[PDB]
Design a protein around this ligand. Structure first.
Ligand SMILES: Nc1ncnc2c1ncn2[C@@H]1O[C@H](CSCC[C@H](N)C(=O)O)[C@@H](O)[C@H]1O
Ligand SMILES: Nc1ncnc2c1ncn2[C@@H]1O[C@H](CSCC[C@H](N)C(=O)O)[C@@H](O)[C@H]1O
Ligand SMILES: O=C(O)C(=O)CCc1ccccc1
Ligand SMILES: O=C(O)C(=O)CCc1ccccc1
Ligand SMILES: [Zn+2]
Ligand SMILES: [Zn+2]
Lengths: 335, 335
């Protein structure tokens, strides 16, 4: 009875916040694949009758899920068939983003590393990531750890036209357009799955007519820059690396094109990841992002120095790097 | 520059320990599937030359993985081709256990919930869990959150024979046998994949000749109790529920058989999960364990009361329940 109590206290300390985070991540990924999570908000209610119908789910099954999440403490039952997210839901979801990204989006790397180590080319085409999961997990991380700084920079200098390259689910644009009343946005992304997710999200935010989703590669922009011109700000979050080190020249043409297409006041903003940081706070997640990129995707992440170097030798001036909350995340501003 | 710093501090607080945990879980699951993690220990070294050969991996690929984990802060490079785990590695691995269990072992439930909601029978046979992942993730959680109390109870009363039903990777037995010099163990488990993992682990701990792994169902024990008799302690961790509510009678025969086969001093110890706790600490992970069991596996988790009730109406006396560190985990001792 003594040592049971001691084993209890010691175990609770060892486990720390991991039980809570493991449970939230699983409930939220499952609910997001169902389409339920888009209906969860601490300030709005989810009416099961309508949502079950909208999502084409048996209402009873939705109720059993929601009751499970209610037991977990992630939602509150407001009345019969009405639920709302717990007050700290957005932070819970943000943290789940990291877990979803490493454990869900990048699962093919985790499961099939042996293949990647022995025959990379065969592995790379056999074990492919689900870009809907890449884009969503990225959005959950972004909400609190990389969107806010870029949002605030974009909001000042009050743009009329914003282009986001490799936009994923288009959350940053939805946010920009929400904050500056007379703005248009174009979100560009190579993945059908991301684009479908985005169009849905954009519609859900009532901006379908203000914010266009165009399914194209960023490479496209080098030869067909007929999407940039008019833009006060061009943004690119975690995409530029997708053409390094293999398409260096294309990258430099996209950069040259960006410089041109800009209104005379505006800027390019690049959110991207720098490789293998050593500082205590950033190092562990930095290493995961770097290893997935380096080893599995064979994309080159550049250092701060290299990025600054490149934006200059692309004809941008006043280029600086800002530290983001997401480990090894950096914001580059090039005017 | 002001608001970048403010967005930084706010983002770091929002993210909390999630970046670190997400990265550790992914590195460790990946490394455990490779067979590397069994070689990681804060007190021993991993010699890449031998391990790469033992694991049938290109040594250079192992080195690149280990260097990534070193950058992450999870291993320390001792010299060329020598590495050891960071000092707090066991706690890191324990926490990764929770993430692995919810996000890896139970992945088929996360990805295919829609199917489970619409046609359960078809879903249950189409989307099946990898029991090697179930057993390993369970072991990582157990290390600090459910093995210690059962270990300490077993170690007292110094047994000669211990049987563990649904033993997974047999860590509890390996630990019991390690602490009481003249003990034999039998670990029983229905999953080939778990048994293979176990035999390997048992061999790695030099107990192959002391600890037998028998691939059988727990149901087996109802009709063929020729595995129990002689036992000072019978243990069963997170298996009993696998015959409820459908094989109630079989469960009661296994229980009756257990009562008989015991030496006159010994006891049955059951580690198992109670459903949907409400207390703040346990509720969130409790709900995940309960929802996976209830909804996806259709196994009945019993409350403390029900379990105590059952162990009595099986002819055990002096039955009590102890709180474990793993949320909604309970240890039942029946003599
Ligand atoms: N060559 C390419 N051209 C355009 N988009 C690309 C690309 N390679 C990858 N992408 C997209 O880039 C995104 C990377 S992650 C999502 C990033 C998003 N801007 C955000 O910050 O939340 C994915 O949506 C992926 O589909
Ligand atoms: N009907 C059954 N008979 C025997 N073992 C079973 C079973 N159903 C599931 N199992 C096994 O029970 C285990 C549940 S999880 C692992 C539990 C292990 N005792 C531990 O505490 O770490 C798995 O190894 C699974 O393969
Ligand atoms: O997945 C990719 O391809 C990326 O570029 C990852 C983008 C990212 C970076 C940090 C946290 C979450 C998401
Ligand atoms: O996966 C199963 O079937 C189980 O019974 C899970 C056993 C378990 C319980 C709590 C944490 C980790 C593992
Ligand atoms: Zn990337
Ligand atoms: Zn179970």
């Amino acid at each position: 009875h003594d040592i049971a109590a001691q084993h209890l206290a010691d175990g609770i300390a060892a486990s720390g916040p991991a039980p809570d985070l493991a449970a939230a991540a699983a409930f939220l990924e499952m609910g997001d694949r169902l389409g339920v999570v888009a209906h969860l908000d601490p300030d709005r209610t989810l009416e099961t009758a309508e949502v079950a119908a909208a999502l084409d789910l048996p209402e009873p099954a939705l109720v059993r899920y929601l009751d499970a999440v209610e037991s977990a403490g992630l939602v509150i039952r407001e009345g019969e068939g009405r639920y709302r997210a717990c007050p700290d839901f957005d932070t819970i979801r943000h943290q789940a983003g990291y877990i979803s990204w490493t454990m869900n989006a990048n699962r093919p790397f985790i499961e099939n590393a042996r293949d990647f180590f022995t025959d990379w080319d065969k592995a790379a085409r056999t074990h492919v990531r689900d870009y809907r999961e890449v884009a969503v997990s990225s959005q959950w991380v972004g909400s609190h750890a990389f969107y806010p700084t870029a949002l605030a920079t974009i909001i000042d200098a009050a743009p009329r036209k914003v282009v986001d390259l490799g936009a994923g689910t288009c959350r940053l644009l939805i946010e920009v357009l929400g904050a500056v009343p007379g703005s248009t946005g174009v979100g560009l992304d190579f993945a059908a799955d991301a684009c479908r997710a985005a169009e849905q999200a954009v519609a859900q935010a009532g901006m379908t007519d203000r914010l266009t989703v165009v399914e194209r590669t960023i490479q496209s922009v080098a030869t067909d820059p007929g999407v940039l011109e008019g833009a006060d700000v061009i943004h690119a979050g975690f995409v530029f690396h997708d053409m390094l080190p293999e398409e260096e020249d294309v990258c430099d043409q996209v950069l040259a094109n960006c410089r041109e297409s800009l209104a005379p006041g505006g800027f390019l903003a690049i959110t991207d990841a720098v490789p293998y940081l050593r500082n205590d706070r950033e190092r562990r997640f930095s290493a995961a992002v770097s290893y997935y990129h380096g080893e599995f995707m064979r994309r080159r992440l550049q250092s701060e120095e290299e990025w600054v170097e490149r934006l200059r030798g692309a004809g941008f001036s006043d280029v600086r790097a800002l530290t983001l909350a997401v480990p090894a995340g950096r914001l580059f501003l090039a005017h």
